Amino acid sequence: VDQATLDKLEAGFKKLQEASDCKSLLKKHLTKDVFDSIKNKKTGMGATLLDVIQSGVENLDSGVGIYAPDAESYRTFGPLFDPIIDDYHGGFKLTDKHPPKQWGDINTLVGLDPAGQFIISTRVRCGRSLQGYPFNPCLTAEQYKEMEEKVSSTLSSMEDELKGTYYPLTGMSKATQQQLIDDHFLFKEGDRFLQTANACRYWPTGRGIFHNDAKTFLVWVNEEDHLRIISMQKGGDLKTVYKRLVTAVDNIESKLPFSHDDRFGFLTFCPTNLGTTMRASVHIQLPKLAKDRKVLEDIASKFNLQVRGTRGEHTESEGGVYDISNKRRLGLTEYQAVREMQDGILEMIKMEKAAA
């Protein structure tokens, strides 16, 4: 670890300590002992603590503030990752291990809002990393291209409901890209948290989106994770949405080798996405309960749910439409994760109906 990087690290620790109004987990859990204990360590690919924490240092409004440049980073820098992971996922000790993959009994899921007055649309995503490839900050341009080839070729073999077309961002018209983002299908371009983590190098090389013609099944290639596998549609039919995701993941898993860890389950670039990697969300209106997004957030948290804006995390609600989803992804099964969203959303709707 070179002196120049230490200089940047030493200054960052100071800034975080000084940042009286910063509320991120990096600031909360990076003690001097923790800082000093791991700041001189390096992975086989050369990732340092600066690579891990830089996004959180520059963006003090981060909720978390760290990413893993490679798989080893999760352990090399364990003293920072471990307490943050334990904190975010609502309890996960050093000695704990994520449970085996388990979709559960899909037929037990219900319609989240039959009368149709609150929920606009429902979405479930997972993430996966390809074996033999490190996370974004350690990839070369050529590797982005190799991965894109592997994934796009694999998805050409999808059949029936899942059959579709791959659209590279390279060559995609600006008008088409903006509509796909505005309609909540395609990942946004230019995220400051990812950018400062050096996760977006060589953009847009190797990046793109696969989807079926109806756009109920989508796959993001080379954004935050190597793959994000997405099922979504209008309405509240979670059972159908979830079933389509399961079908897709089971079929894709048989074809492509994904990184899985005995302790952390499926590996991802952000520690919030470990384990099941699953984020099940609704776009929902709750005008009475949301009369102050800070009140909404306090209610949601007790149901282990997270509130995001209409265009995703770090955005505002528009027209009263909030994104509400399970917060926890690690230390519970896929079934348990999706049920927390279902259970929480059904009750919040009950509360909305009962509210004055």
Ligand SMILES: Nc1ncnc2c1ncn2[C@@H]1O[C@H](COP(=O)(O)OP(=O)(O)O)[C@@H](O)[C@H]1O
């Ligand atoms: N329930 C939903 N219905 C429609 N679009 C959604 C829903 N939940 C999230 N989205 C969209 O997904 C995109 C990604 O947003 P982010 O907040 O980055 O989620 P993740 O990275 O976990 O998908 C954004 O355009 C957001 O609008």
Ligand SMILES: NCCC[C@H](N)C(=O)O
């Ligand atoms: N994936 C959610 C984390 C986004 C950003 N690193 C933050 O800490 O807010």
Ligand SMILES: [Mg+2]
């Ligand atoms: Mg995202």
